[PDB]
Amino acid sequence: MLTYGAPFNFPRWIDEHAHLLKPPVGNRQVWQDSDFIVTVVGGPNHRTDYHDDPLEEFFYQLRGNAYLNLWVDGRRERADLKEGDIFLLPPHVRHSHQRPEAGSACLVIERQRPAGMLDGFEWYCDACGHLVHRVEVQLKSIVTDLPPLFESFYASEDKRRCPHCGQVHPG
Ligand SMILES: [Fe+2]
Ligand SMILES: [Fe+2]
């Protein structure tokens, strides 16, 4: 009943999957159908959306440097993930995970969401900090439900107009 297999060497697994840590996919899950969602995140990859995870996220930056853009107490903040850093993110802290370096690798551990507990993705306005857009989605469906929601927000400027000012968010 060792459902997830035997122990194996992690640096070698990361070496073997380094081509998946590059653009365009930029990440690779370790075990399937587990309660703990164990992912290695690579680079270069940049994103303007903020994740609203209903549960905690654990980070261990194994290779290279990266950083999280955070929405903390109404303001934008930057949390560095230098090589060797660990970090535990409380639920619902909006975060945008930036990875400027090729060859970087970050261990990210999350929990499977119970059904009905949805993930949020949001965009904020650079000028007034107001929320511009939010989409919601069940984690188990993201590979095949999120890009069209992103694309729809990205392919058109009405959704990008901040309701408090009018600045069209980028694309
Ligand atoms: Fe996240
Ligand atoms: Fe604004």
mmCIF file of all heavy atoms in Angstrom, residues 125 127-130 162 164-165 167, ligand 2:
data_model
loop_
_atom_site.group_PDB
_atom_site.id
_atom_site.type_symbol
_atom_site.label_atom_id
_atom_site.label_comp_id
_atom_site.label_asym_id
_atom_site.label_seq_id
_atom_site.Cartn_x
_atom_site.Cartn_y
_atom_site.Cartn_z
ATOM 1 N N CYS A 125 -5.181 47.103 -9.882
ATOM 2 C CA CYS A 125 -4.814 48.258 -10.689
ATOM 3 C C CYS A 125 -3.530 48.894 -10.172
ATOM 4 O O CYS A 125 -3.413 49.194 -8.981
ATOM 5 C CB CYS A 125 -5.920 49.311 -10.729
ATOM 6 S SG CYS A 125 -5.536 50.547 -11.994
ATOM 7 N N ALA A 127 -2.463 51.886 -10.556
ATOM 8 C CA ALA A 127 -2.520 53.284 -10.155
ATOM 9 C C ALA A 127 -3.218 53.457 -8.808
ATOM 10 O O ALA A 127 -2.673 54.102 -7.904
ATOM 11 C CB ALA A 127 -3.190 54.115 -11.242
ATOM 12 N N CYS A 128 -4.410 52.886 -8.636
ATOM 13 C CA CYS A 128 -5.149 53.071 -7.392
ATOM 14 C C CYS A 128 -5.222 51.815 -6.533
ATOM 15 O O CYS A 128 -5.803 51.863 -5.441
ATOM 16 C CB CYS A 128 -6.566 53.586 -7.674
ATOM 17 S SG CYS A 128 -7.704 52.381 -8.378
ATOM 18 N N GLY A 129 -4.648 50.700 -6.979
ATOM 19 C CA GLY A 129 -4.644 49.500 -6.163
ATOM 20 C C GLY A 129 -5.977 48.799 -6.042
ATOM 21 O O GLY A 129 -6.105 47.870 -5.236
ATOM 22 N N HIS A 130 -6.974 49.213 -6.814
ATOM 23 C CA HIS A 130 -8.299 48.624 -6.738
ATOM 24 C C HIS A 130 -8.354 47.306 -7.500
ATOM 25 O O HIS A 130 -7.675 47.117 -8.514
ATOM 26 C CB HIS A 130 -9.340 49.587 -7.311
ATOM 27 C CG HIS A 130 -10.714 49.392 -6.761
ATOM 28 N ND1 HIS A 130 -11.700 48.714 -7.447
ATOM 29 C CD2 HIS A 130 -11.273 49.789 -5.593
ATOM 30 C CE1 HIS A 130 -12.806 48.697 -6.723
ATOM 31 N NE2 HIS A 130 -12.573 49.342 -5.593
ATOM 32 N N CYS A 162 -10.192 49.516 -14.797
ATOM 33 C CA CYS A 162 -10.425 49.585 -13.365
ATOM 34 C C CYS A 162 -11.746 50.299 -13.095
ATOM 35 O O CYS A 162 -11.995 51.375 -13.659
ATOM 36 C CB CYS A 162 -9.270 50.296 -12.664
ATOM 37 S SG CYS A 162 -9.593 50.865 -10.979
ATOM 38 N N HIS A 164 -12.566 51.982 -10.708
ATOM 39 C CA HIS A 164 -12.348 53.152 -9.879
ATOM 40 C C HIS A 164 -11.581 54.265 -10.588
ATOM 41 O O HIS A 164 -11.314 55.290 -9.959
ATOM 42 C CB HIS A 164 -11.605 52.726 -8.598
ATOM 43 C CG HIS A 164 -11.580 53.765 -7.511
ATOM 44 N ND1 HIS A 164 -10.760 54.873 -7.560
ATOM 45 C CD2 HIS A 164 -12.269 53.861 -6.347
ATOM 46 C CE1 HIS A 164 -10.946 55.608 -6.478
ATOM 47 N NE2 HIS A 164 -11.858 55.018 -5.726
ATOM 48 N N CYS A 165 -11.207 54.103 -11.862
ATOM 49 C CA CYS A 165 -10.289 55.052 -12.474
ATOM 50 C C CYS A 165 -10.295 55.009 -13.990
ATOM 51 O O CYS A 165 -10.191 56.059 -14.637
ATOM 52 C CB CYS A 165 -8.894 54.807 -12.039
ATOM 53 S SG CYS A 165 -8.340 55.245 -10.366
ATOM 54 N N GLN A 167 -7.974 53.081 -15.879
ATOM 55 C CA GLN A 167 -6.732 52.587 -16.466
ATOM 56 C C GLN A 167 -6.924 51.170 -16.965
ATOM 57 O O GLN A 167 -7.372 50.287 -16.223
ATOM 58 C CB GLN A 167 -5.568 52.622 -15.472
ATOM 59 C CG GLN A 167 -5.622 53.702 -14.426
ATOM 60 C CD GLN A 167 -6.393 53.256 -13.225
ATOM 61 O OE1 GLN A 167 -7.340 52.493 -13.339
ATOM 62 N NE2 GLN A 167 -5.955 53.665 -12.051
HETATM 63 FE FE FE B 2 -7.461 52.088 -10.414
#
